[PDB]
Amino acid sequence: IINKKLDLSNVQSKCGSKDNIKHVPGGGSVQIVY
Amino acid sequence: IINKKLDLSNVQSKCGSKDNIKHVPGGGSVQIVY
Amino acid sequence: IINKKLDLSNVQSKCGSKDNIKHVPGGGSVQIVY
Amino acid sequence: LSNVQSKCGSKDNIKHVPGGGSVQIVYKPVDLSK
Amino acid sequence: LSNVQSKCGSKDNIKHVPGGGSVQIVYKPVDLSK
Amino acid sequence: LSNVQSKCGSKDNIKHVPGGGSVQIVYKPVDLSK
16 A cells, blocks of 8 residues: 655765966066166 | 655765965065176 | 655765965065175 | 755855066166266 | 755855065165266 | 755865065165265
8 A cells, every 4th residue: 555755865976176276476576787 | 554765865985175276476576786 | 554764864985175275475585786 | 845966166256366566666876977 | 855965175255366576676876986 | 854965175265365575675875986
């Protein structure tokens, strides 16, 4: 007689960010020779 | 007779950030020769 | 007669951040020769 | 009822404003022969 | 009822503002012969 | 009822503001022959 089954499931594998952030704003330079 | 099953799941395998943040703002330089 | 089962599950494996943060703001330099 | 697997590797409300270098030189040397 | 596997490797509200270097030289030397 | 596997390797409200180096030289040598 009466029967029910509720089943939703979430799965992940090798996953997620490998982000590189690499700012090199090097500056403000004066070479001043007389 | 009456029967019910409720089945909620979350799974992970090897997962999450390998981030690399690497700012090199090197600067403010004077080379002043007379 | 009457039967029920409620079943909640979370699972993880080798998981979470391997983050590198590596700022090198080296500066403020004067080379001053007469 | 609901089931929501959701956002991975997402990036949100990010600013990048790397701003390297400036110079405000004022050059007023004085140099004479007789 | 609900089931929510959720955000991994996400990034939110981040600022990067690396700002390297500046120079404010004022160069008023004085040099004479006779 | 609810089940929520949640945030791993997430990043939220981060700042990076490495601001390396500055120079404020005021150069006023005085240099003479007669």
